[PDB]
Amino acid sequence: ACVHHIKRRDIVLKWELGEGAFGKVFLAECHNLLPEQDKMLVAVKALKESESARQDFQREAELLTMLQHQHIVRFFGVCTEGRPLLMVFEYMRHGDLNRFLRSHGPDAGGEDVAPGPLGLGQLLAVASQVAAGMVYLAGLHFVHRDLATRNCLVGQGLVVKIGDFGMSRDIYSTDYYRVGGRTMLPIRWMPPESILYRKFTTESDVWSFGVVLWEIFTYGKQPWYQLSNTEAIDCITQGRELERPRACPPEVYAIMRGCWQREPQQRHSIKDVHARLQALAQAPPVYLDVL
Ligand SMILES: CC(C)(C)c1cc(NC(=O)COC(=O)c2ccc(-n3cnnn3)cc2)n(-c2ccccc2)n1
Secondary structure: OOOOEOOHHHEEEEEEEEEOOOEEEEEEEEEOOOOOOOEEEEEEEEEOOOOHHHHHHHHHHHHHHHOOOOOEOOEEEEEOOOOOOEEEEEOOOOOEHHHHHHHOOOOOOOOOOOOOOOOHHHHHHHHHHHHHHHHHHHHOOOOOOOOOHHHEEEEOOOEEEEOOOOOHHHHOHHHOEEEOOOEEEOHHHOOHHHHHHOOOOHHHHHHHHHHHHHHHHOOOOOOOOOOOHHHHHHHHHOOOOOOOOOOOOHHHHHHHHHHOOOOHHHOOOHHHHHHHHHHHHOOOHHHHHHO
16 A cells, blocks of 8 residues: 555664553664654554454555644554564653643643643643644544544654544553444434434534544543433433533633534534634633633
């Protein structure tokens, strides 16, 4: 295929970062990858096992290459020469966004972030970048089907990027409802038409962003954490909706409710939601203090 390739001798593994059921991730040095950077760090996902998995690897590499954008996960290329098959990603300091949110919550500094909880303007900065990525995917008419903070990485300078990780099914297994045997539905992020009728569209993606907007202002709490999976399915289908968090100002909770309209056709577009959040994010301290 028309993906970029990387020679094994340029890659040098340092240590393991994480281990899913279908993939290990390592930190590694990569030589001669970029022009200005002779020696840079990278994340290296190694494929596990099977003849069926070799095809899924192929599909990922193609999708990732053609769907590159400032706020989508950065992908350099593969290493086909000799097993195991490697995928080279850009290394992201702070890990996934859920972990980052939990570590800087109201439960009581650093290089990238001030001490204590994240500020209103900092929270809105994260919401805007995640929103910016969904405008790009909506534009090309690709549906994510599993948008959450656990599938968002954070880097140096608090740069946030959207992805889709198989490690999330192991680390955050509680966030999925198992069905059939090998299927896993993230019911707490899904709209009514997805749960009942099993239809996923761009409108079903906006609902999930509303739930992602709720995650951020709760500093990474699970939606409907008090309810079990079956209790949560009853709750969403019967039209009951999440509360406004303590950190969330009224103006921002209006944007969540905007995403949560029952009939899909009456929900707001992702472009208009981004417009509000980016405008709100870049607003001056005088405006945001009275917000
Ligand atoms: C563009 C979008 C969102 C539609 C998409 C993206 C992916 N694939 C990924 O996200 C994969 O990423 C990593 O494996 C990864 C692991 C570890 C790291 N890192 C840790 N520390 N630093 N980096 C960084 C990436 N898709 C996919 C498509 C088909 C099948 C499966 C997945 N679909």
